[PDB]
Amino acid sequence: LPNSIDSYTDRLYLLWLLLVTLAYNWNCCFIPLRLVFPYQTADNIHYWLIADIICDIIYLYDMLFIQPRLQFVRGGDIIVDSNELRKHYRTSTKFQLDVASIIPFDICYLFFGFNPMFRANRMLKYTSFFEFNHHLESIMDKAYIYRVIRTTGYLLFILHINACVYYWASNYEGIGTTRWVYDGEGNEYLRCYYWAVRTLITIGGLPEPQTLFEIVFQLLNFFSGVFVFSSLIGQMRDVIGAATANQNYFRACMDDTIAYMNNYSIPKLVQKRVRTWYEYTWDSQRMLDESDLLKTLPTTVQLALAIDVNFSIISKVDLFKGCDTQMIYDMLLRLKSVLYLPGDFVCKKGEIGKEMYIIKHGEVQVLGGPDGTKVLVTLKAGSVFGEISLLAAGGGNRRTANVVAHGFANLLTLDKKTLQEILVHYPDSERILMKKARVLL
Amino acid sequence: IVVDPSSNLYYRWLTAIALPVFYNWYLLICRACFDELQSEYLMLWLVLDYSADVLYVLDVLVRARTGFLEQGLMVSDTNRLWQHYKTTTQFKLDVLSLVPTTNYPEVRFNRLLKFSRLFEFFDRTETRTNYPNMFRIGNLVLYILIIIHWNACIYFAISKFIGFGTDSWVYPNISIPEHGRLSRKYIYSLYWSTLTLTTIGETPPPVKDEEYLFVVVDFLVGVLIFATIVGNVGSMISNMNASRAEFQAKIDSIKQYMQFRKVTKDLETRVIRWFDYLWANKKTVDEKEVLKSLPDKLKAEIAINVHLDTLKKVRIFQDCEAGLLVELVLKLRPTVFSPGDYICKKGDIGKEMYIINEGKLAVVADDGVTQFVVLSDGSYFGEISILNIKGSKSGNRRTANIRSIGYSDLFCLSKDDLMEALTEYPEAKKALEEKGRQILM
Amino acid sequence: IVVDPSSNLYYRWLTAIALPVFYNWYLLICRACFDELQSEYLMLWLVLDYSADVLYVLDVLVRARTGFLEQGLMVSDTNRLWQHYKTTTQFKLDVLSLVNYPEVRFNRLLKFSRLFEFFDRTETRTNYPNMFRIGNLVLYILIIIHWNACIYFAISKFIGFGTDSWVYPNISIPEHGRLSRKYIYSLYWSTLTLTTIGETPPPVKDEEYLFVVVDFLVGVLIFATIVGNVGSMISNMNASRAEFQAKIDSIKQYMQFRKVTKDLETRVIRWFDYLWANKKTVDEKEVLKSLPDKLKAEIAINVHLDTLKKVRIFGLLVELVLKLRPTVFSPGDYICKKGDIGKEMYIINEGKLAVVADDGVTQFVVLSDGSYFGEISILNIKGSKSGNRRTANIRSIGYSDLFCLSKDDLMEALTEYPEAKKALEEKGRQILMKDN
Amino acid sequence: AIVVDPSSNLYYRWLTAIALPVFYNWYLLICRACFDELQSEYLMLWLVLDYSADVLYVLDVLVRARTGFLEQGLMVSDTNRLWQHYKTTTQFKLDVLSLVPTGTNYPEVRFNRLLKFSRLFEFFDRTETRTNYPNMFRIGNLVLYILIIIHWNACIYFAISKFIGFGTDSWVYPNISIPEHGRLSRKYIYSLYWSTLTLTTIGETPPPVKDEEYLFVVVDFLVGVLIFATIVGNVGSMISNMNASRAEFQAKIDSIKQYMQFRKVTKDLETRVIRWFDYLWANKKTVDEKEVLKSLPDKLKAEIAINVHLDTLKKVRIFQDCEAGLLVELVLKLRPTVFSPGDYICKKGDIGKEMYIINEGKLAVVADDGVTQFVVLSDGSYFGEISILNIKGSKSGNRRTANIRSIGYSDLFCLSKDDLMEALTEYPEAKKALEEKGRQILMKDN
Ligand SMILES: Nc1nc2c(ncn2[C@@H]2O[C@@H]3COP(=O)(O)O[C@H]3[C@H]2O)c(=O)[nH]1
Ligand SMILES: Nc1nc2c(ncn2[C@@H]2O[C@@H]3COP(=O)(O)O[C@H]3[C@H]2O)c(=O)[nH]1
Ligand SMILES: Nc1nc2c(ncn2[C@@H]2O[C@@H]3COP(=O)(O)O[C@H]3[C@H]2O)c(=O)[nH]1
Ligand SMILES: Nc1nc2c(ncn2[C@@H]2O[C@@H]3COP(=O)(O)O[C@H]3[C@H]2O)c(=O)[nH]1
Ligand SMILES: *[C@@H]1O[C@H](CO)[C@@H](O)[C@H](O)[C@H]1NC(C)=O
Numbered sequence A: 001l002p003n004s005i006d007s008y009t010d011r012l013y014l015l016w017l018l019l020v021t022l023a024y025n026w027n028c029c030f031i032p033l034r035l036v037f038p039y040q041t042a043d044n045i046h047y048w049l050i051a052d053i054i055c056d057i058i059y060l061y062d063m064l065f066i067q068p069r070l071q072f073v074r075g076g077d078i079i080v081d082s083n084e085l086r087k088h089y090r091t092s093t094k095f096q097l098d099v100a101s102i103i104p105f106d107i108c109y110l111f112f113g114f115n116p117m118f119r120a121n122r123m124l125k126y127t128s129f130f131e132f133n134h135h136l137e138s139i140m141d142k143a144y145i146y147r148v149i150r151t152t153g154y155l156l157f158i159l160h161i162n163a164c165v166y167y168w169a170s171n172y173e174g175i176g177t178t179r180w181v182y183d184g185e186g187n188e189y190l191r192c193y194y195w196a197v198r199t200l201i202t203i204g205g206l207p208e209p210q211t212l213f214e215i216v217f218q219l220l221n222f223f224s225g226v227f228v229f230s231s232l233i234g235q236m237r238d239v240i241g242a243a244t245a246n247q248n249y250f251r252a253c254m255d256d257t258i259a260y261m262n263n264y265s266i267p268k269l270v271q272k273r274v275r276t277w278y279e280y281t282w283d284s285q286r287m288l289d290e291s292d293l294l295k296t297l298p299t300t301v302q303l304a305l306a307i308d309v310n311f312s313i314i315s316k317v318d319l320f321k322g323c324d325t326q327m328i329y330d331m332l333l334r335l336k337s338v339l340y341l342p343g344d345f346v347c348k349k350g351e352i353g354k355e356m357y358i359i360k361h362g363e364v365q366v367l368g369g370p371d372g373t374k375v376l377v378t379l380k381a382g383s384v385f386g387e388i389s390l391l392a393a394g395g396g397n398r399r400t401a402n403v404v405a406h407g408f409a410n411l412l413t414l415d416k417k418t419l420q421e422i423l424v425h426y427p428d429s430e431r432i433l434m435k436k437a438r439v440l441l
Numbered sequence B: 001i002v003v004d005p006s007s008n009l010y011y012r013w014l015t016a017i018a019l020p021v022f023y024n025w026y027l028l029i030c031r032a033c034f035d036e037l038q039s040e041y042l043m044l045w046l047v048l049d050y051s052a053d054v055l056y057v058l059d060v061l062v063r064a065r066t067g068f069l070e071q072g073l074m075v076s077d078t079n080r081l082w083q084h085y086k087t088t089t090q091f092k093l094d095v096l097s098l099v100p101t102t103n104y105p106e107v108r109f110n111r112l113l114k115f116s117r118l119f120e121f122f123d124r125t126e127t128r129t130n131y132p133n134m135f136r137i138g139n140l141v142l143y144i145l146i147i148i149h150w151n152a153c154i155y156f157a158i159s160k161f162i163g164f165g166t167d168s169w170v171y172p173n174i175s176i177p178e179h180g181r182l183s184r185k186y187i188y189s190l191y192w193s194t195l196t197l198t199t200i201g202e203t204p205p206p207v208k209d210e211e212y213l214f215v216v217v218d219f220l221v222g223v224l225i226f227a228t229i230v231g232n233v234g235s236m237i238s239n240m241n242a243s244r245a246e247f248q249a250k251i252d253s254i255k256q257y258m259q260f261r262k263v264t265k266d267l268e269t270r271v272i273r274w275f276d277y278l279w280a281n282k283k284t285v286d287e288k289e290v291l292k293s294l295p296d297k298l299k300a301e302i303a304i305n306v307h308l309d310t311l312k313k314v315r316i317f318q319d320c321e322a323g324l325l326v327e328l329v330l331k332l333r334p335t336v337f338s339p340g341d342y343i344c345k346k347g348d349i350g351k352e353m354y355i356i357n358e359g360k361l362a363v364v365a366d367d368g369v370t371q372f373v374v375l376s377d378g379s380y381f382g383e384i385s386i387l388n389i390k391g392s393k394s395g396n397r398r399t400a401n402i403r404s405i406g407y408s409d410l411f412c413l414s415k416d417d418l419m420e421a422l423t424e425y426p427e428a429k430k431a432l433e434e435k436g437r438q439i440l441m
Numbered sequence C: 001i002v003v004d005p006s007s008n009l010y011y012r013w014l015t016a017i018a019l020p021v022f023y024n025w026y027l028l029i030c031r032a033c034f035d036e037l038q039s040e041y042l043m044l045w046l047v048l049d050y051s052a053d054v055l056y057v058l059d060v061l062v063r064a065r066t067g068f069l070e071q072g073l074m075v076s077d078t079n080r081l082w083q084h085y086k087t088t089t090q091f092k093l094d095v096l097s098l099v100n101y102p103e104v105r106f107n108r109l110l111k112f113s114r115l116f117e118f119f120d121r122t123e124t125r126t127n128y129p130n131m132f133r134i135g136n137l138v139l140y141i142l143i144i145i146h147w148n149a150c151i152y153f154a155i156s157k158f159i160g161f162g163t164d165s166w167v168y169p170n171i172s173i174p175e176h177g178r179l180s181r182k183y184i185y186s187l188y189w190s191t192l193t194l195t196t197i198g199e200t201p202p203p204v205k206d207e208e209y210l211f212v213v214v215d216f217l218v219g220v221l222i223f224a225t226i227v228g229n230v231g232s233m234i235s236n237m238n239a240s241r242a243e244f245q246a247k248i249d250s251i252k253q254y255m256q257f258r259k260v261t262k263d264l265e266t267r268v269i270r271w272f273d274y275l276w277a278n279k280k281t282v283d284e285k286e287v288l289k290s291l292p293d294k295l296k297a298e299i300a301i302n303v304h305l306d307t308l309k310k311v312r313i314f315g316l317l318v319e320l321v322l323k324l325r326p327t328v329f330s331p332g333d334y335i336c337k338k339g340d341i342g343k344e345m346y347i348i349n350e351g352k353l354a355v356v357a358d359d360g361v362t363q364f365v366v367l368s369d370g371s372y373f374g375e376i377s378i379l380n381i382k383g384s385k386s387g388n389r390r391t392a393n394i395r396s397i398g399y400s401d402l403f404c405l406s407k408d409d410l411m412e413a414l415t416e417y418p419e420a421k422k423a424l425e426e427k428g429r430q431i432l433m434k435d436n
Numbered sequence D: 001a002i003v004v005d006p007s008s009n010l011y012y013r014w015l016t017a018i019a020l021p022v023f024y025n026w027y028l029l030i031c032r033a034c035f036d037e038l039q040s041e042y043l044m045l046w047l048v049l050d051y052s053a054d055v056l057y058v059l060d061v062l063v064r065a066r067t068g069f070l071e072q073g074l075m076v077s078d079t080n081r082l083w084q085h086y087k088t089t090t091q092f093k094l095d096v097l098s099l100v101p102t103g104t105n106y107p108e109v110r111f112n113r114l115l116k117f118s119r120l121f122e123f124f125d126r127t128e129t130r131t132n133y134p135n136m137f138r139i140g141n142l143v144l145y146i147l148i149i150i151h152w153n154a155c156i157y158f159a160i161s162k163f164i165g166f167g168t169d170s171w172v173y174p175n176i177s178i179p180e181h182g183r184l185s186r187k188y189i190y191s192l193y194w195s196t197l198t199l200t201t202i203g204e205t206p207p208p209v210k211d212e213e214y215l216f217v218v219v220d221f222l223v224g225v226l227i228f229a230t231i232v233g234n235v236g237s238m239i240s241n242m243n244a245s246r247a248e249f250q251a252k253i254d255s256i257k258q259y260m261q262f263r264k265v266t267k268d269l270e271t272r273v274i275r276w277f278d279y280l281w282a283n284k285k286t287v288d289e290k291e292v293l294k295s296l297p298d299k300l301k302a303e304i305a306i307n308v309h310l311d312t313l314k315k316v317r318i319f320q321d322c323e324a325g326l327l328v329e330l331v332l333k334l335r336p337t338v339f340s341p342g343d344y345i346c347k348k349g350d351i352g353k354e355m356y357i358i359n360e361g362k363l364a365v366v367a368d369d370g371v372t373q374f375v376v377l378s379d380g381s382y383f384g385e386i387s388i389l390n391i392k393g394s395k396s397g398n399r400r401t402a403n404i405r406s407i408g409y410s411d412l413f414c415l416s417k418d419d420l421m422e423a424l425t426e427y428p429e430a431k432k433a434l435e436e437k438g439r440q441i442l443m444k445d446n
């Protein structure tokens, strides 16, 4: 119990909000059951009453001891002080819903008899239930499992409410009076839940309604069953579609590429190379275009992720040891990552040079011996190759040697006009790069 | 007078004429089929039909006195309004819907022809009101009850044509006291209609050829029409949930990315908390696309109405020549900064300004956190990248290390945006002189 | 002769050959499974089958003399047309489809390709595409329900009429022995099975149980697919209206969140009411972004050349229409105030604009649809006490529509001929000589 | 010790040869456990198939012991490293739990060897990657899933009917001492009938009378609703997903149609754009090339664009004496469009922003007005070089010198001006050849 709970990073607040959910769902599940079924009898009414006292003191102790500890952001800065937190809570609407939820009808049971229709104000902590849902979906990594569990629980709750309202209709018409109502043989909850399933799923096959109240009940219940079944199967579907929408977008792009290259009759070696690229891209990235996700974010967010991953990779390499930090960080924003299959060339001895590769999670092999098969060095991850193309106008020495990708190399490219427009803003870093060129040649 | 067809007087008339069309469709198909309604409540249908007839005559008068846009101006010449009303097909629909011609509502069945008023009322309300998804659910449920009610009256008319109680499929023998009540007739016909059109089918099977063919055609109309309106209700629920679903798919995508790349946990929770700040303060939507679809004077007026009041409390207040200020208001973009990230680093290349709005940020030093001043709400920082001369300082770089203390929201006035904004003005020169005083002090 | 596939004669032949294919599918399964249409009226099916084989032989002739495209030109030699037709799977299917007596005549169903080509060409040709779409999907579900009715009556004939409870009953009964009740009860059984209502007499044998299981699985999968396609098409019939309503709802959500005042709320809702009631709710260069440049510029010329040929000063106007950009202005709207940076001229298209001096009142001249403005600021008058500025005040009277023309676009479109340059600059010198 | 690789074809052949017994076990183990006649009537057949399945499972462990995995881009072949990386994980734990050794009348003790669902799903993922009809394979895969669910619920209904008692009441399977319901075919096909009518939520079956039957029918209806409606909706989505591309093209056509019917475009031009849509659909040129390859690297995109246009680029006089990197970057920058018959590719005097290369077309150089053909240009040639590259010894600069009309349905390679100037930086020779070609054709035409 601290002085102010940080609601996004508190596992004890997540467990406590779970304990409030296990009182609110107790109320919503066992208020109509005690209200309309003969289960709150003279025997276990003290069991139901001590469960009611436990849930009510969870409500009251939750409000008065956890809710003014909630930190909140006013004007951008995080508010920590307890009087300001208590003022923000007590002049809010969550306090209005909780104080409308905690109005006791405990004075009213002893006057007007024991009846849980008086507990129809305790179903107003839906904002705390939705806060628990949002916090558990923010804590969980695979939130679609909790979303399909929550949609299944919504379906079971609507079937539970329909079972209670069907037992109301059968007790209103009399049990065993007509052929439509519940006959009274077996389990009173199970044989009404079966009717709720076969009505709100709209299966049918039940005994037909006889009189006018049963025809109105069966009409409204099949209509609401059509809409609730359509809406909840649409929710369960959308959830199961948005779970694997990334893999479905990848497979749609892969089938589109394969369909195009099959309609234009490209040979099987090129089709195997494109399928090998798509297989390794889903195997190593789980994503088609990394710039698609790193272009919808702002500049500081993209720069923070870039300085994390790529400044680890470039603080590993020794060729950038004294350059300027904003020039390096704009290079980290400007670094383009491509993937090379095992075997293909990334520089040929004779072509022009416009790229500076920074190898990350790969293995390339330079080849410049007598006949291009002797490996001079095998560059591992976190190295730099392709830096000769700064001086001599790009054509005094175009490309020095062959260099292939020995494995699945994932190089970080850099276009030459982008490197020059980065480097014209830094003449001291240009002098360091000319010093690197003079120690190179 | 000339009724303006964009005014609230015309919308009030669209409400007052979309009431009797709704009445005419529902209760004319009900009265022409259930004879007990027309027999019993005859003074009620004479009063309601006289009211609907005088409102149809007033609709012909209002559509004769309704202006229209020619060369952008409303035509007030009433004879040209009457000729423009005559030269279309709505005049023929109104004349055929207003033919004055006690057990015959077949002469009243031509008063259903004025459906354009009802569809125009639904379109004008769906444009006008602030609860569009609730109105679309109400309009769809109104269409469902039109279809179900009309099919109920078609079933009772087919049962009356075949014969009451001479069959296992038709409505039973209405001379019996249970089946002969009009409320049971209408509610059992609605029960049959919903049970057939929703493809549940808990009705008795047909035994004659026309009942077989009508049940086949009504099953097929029911499955097509009810898959259509089930898809419409699912599309309205998806369009009601789509903004939160798109944001949650964005959070799941960036969390899958940051948990597959193995970034640091503090950077991951900083990005996730900043996105949750964006969702809780509803700044996650962009203004660029929606005000791009809006026209120029309206996007300028709305931008003035929201931004100019915040621009009053900054020092950039200008007593005359406020065209620079309205160009700044058009040239804003609200960007949000999490607490802990730096807005401008010490000694970097500058290309953009910042104007503080609902934030609190302070300059720091190079060694650690040492707040010299705190730039509160209504301040501005930037303006060293406006091509200053070498006055008091050596060169123009971002000359103070400045960090956000809370969740600051800033604007971003770029380089060429400022060179196009504060051109032809000495206000750039006096801003150069105040920032010269800032680099002096 | 040589017919070309993009022609109206080829579309008329696609209709004339899509009639007997649809007839052949529907009524050959009905005849060959119901076995009483034959013995009732053999003569009508004899003359309709003769008409169908005549149209099939003429379809082999038309597909023999149907041209094709190599190097962009229509191939016209009939020997190479016959060779290029004869080397194909469609010629194989037509010569297999020409090999009364309906179980023998089940070969004729192989020409489905002409019916699908008719559906695609009608879809590309007609002006009611969503109505045609849902029409051919209603034809698809009616063909599947009809074929399942015929398959159920054939399995009922194979097992026995009225031997048990599942099958069609005994046809020696005079009520169950009419062809109308046989077809409409088979249609009722296939509707109850394929829409998965159930409610039939239950199967009591192994082949009947297997057929009801396979029929329910085909009904679930295929009818969920096609009736979902009909539902998606009727919900897609209003797509531009739904996109316009989504734009309206998101703009209203922005104005309700950002505390935009009631006057601006009412004015934005009035502008959207104008944009819906005047049918200007579509975006021309957003719907025309896929056309090539010849057809795009030609339809732009075809919709704007009558407006551009009513300008008071112009003779060639082709190179100006494809560089326009139409904007619509509100009533009471200021285009350019007295003294402003001027970057574009405007040509009025069915609008009324005037010139003011006292901020709204004392209008000097009004400028109708056959005029234009903006000829001063972007045109270099090389003097006359003005540079890069606007010396006028224009207020928009009604809902005016006008095309803006940028300075760079007019400079690239004003170098081909100096006659328009000389006339435009002479009118500009006269205008600010009369004003200054 | 030869190490197999998971990107080969022999590993896919092994994935087929091991997804056959996993599908046999998942289909027939619950059926042999729940129908008592399949275990005792057929006895040598399941002994042979179970011996084959156990031998293939032991060989699956011996193959996954020697299956390589990619570390730092390259495959590994250290057998002890592969065995330790295998022995770490839960797939080895599931394989050893699937291969414990566990008369001859109970296959319910053989329920531990349906634990290779990961191997079956790996086969389905690799077939969905490798095949040429992926949407039809996905439809067959989800139809196999709902057939597995219907078969498993049929066997579970017959097991619950056996546990309660045959023919004691109305809901259960009837009395199997009766010779009608006593046959195995009647048992299995009636259990499939009850399973289909429960899981498809039709419910024309006899209703339950006892509480365990009520609980099983409620749980079975809910399992049918959630899982069966999810996979049936996925079947409908994957059938409509291949119609969605043609529906996107048709929605583009209907948007242009409603534009032209709103703006009242004339009839022969409306007919000509309808013929353009009919040509664009009847010649199957609808998929945008650089948009459908918008995420590939430039090497594989250039290999695709060379192996498409190879018969066109072998005829061009540019690409016979130029450099390979210039050829690669130019075919990365070539964006093709298709022109109509009788249209001006270029006017007499215009602002030239691109260069065109012929690709299966036929166009001719017409005069200032009308169709008087001077020189017909077949496939492989090019035009636009005079207005793209500035001739120093010309009578006019950045203006075109000729009128070119297309006679047939031509397809030209649009190569823009700035793309050619950024492609001709370090390749001076081909630029000089185009410069002297433009200079000699301008000295022909003054
Ligand atoms: N030729 C050569 N290049 C090397 C060697 N080690 C690293 N490199 C880099 O490999 C390169 C491949 O491309 P470059 O010709 O551009 O320039 C060469 C060098 O920067 C080596 O031993 N020889
Ligand atoms: N150099 C400086 N900048 C200050 C100070 N107080 C506020 N600022 C702002 O901090 C800045 C950081 O970025 P700028 O160089 O763009 O411009 C500077 C000023 O606008 C101060 O004391 N010194
Ligand atoms: N100054 C001026 N402009 C006029 C007059 N009549 C029409 N116009 C147009 O009004 C204009 C407003 O914008 P511009 O300065 O761009 O150019 C001016 C002219 O094209 C007139 O009498 N004076
Ligand atoms: N000027 C000219 N161009 C020709 C001739 N024959 C083919 N062409 C091409 O036609 C062209 C039209 O456009 P360009 O000026 O771009 O370049 C010219 C040439 O490539 C000819 O005889 N003269
Ligand atoms: C309806 O009931 C009356 C008696 O109330 C009877 O005379 C008549 O025959 C019945 N008609 C039918 C069709 O059953």
Ligand SMILES: *[C@@H]1O[C@H](CO)[C@@H](O)[C@H](O)[C@H]1NC(C)=O
Residues within 6 Å of the ligand: C160, C161, C162, C163, C170, C171, C172, C173
């Ligand atoms: C059909 O009816 C006829 C006479 O009614 C009878 O002889 C025949 O046996 C019946 N067929 C069957 C299969 O019951």
Ligand SMILES: *[C@@H]1O[C@H](CO)[C@@H](O)[C@H](O)[C@H]1NC(C)=O
Residues within 6 Å of the ligand: D165, D166, D167, D168, D175, D176, D177, D178
């Ligand atoms: C099944 O039938 C036999 C005779 O046919 C009977 O003796 C037996 O009791 C029946 N089984 C049950 C469970 O009733």
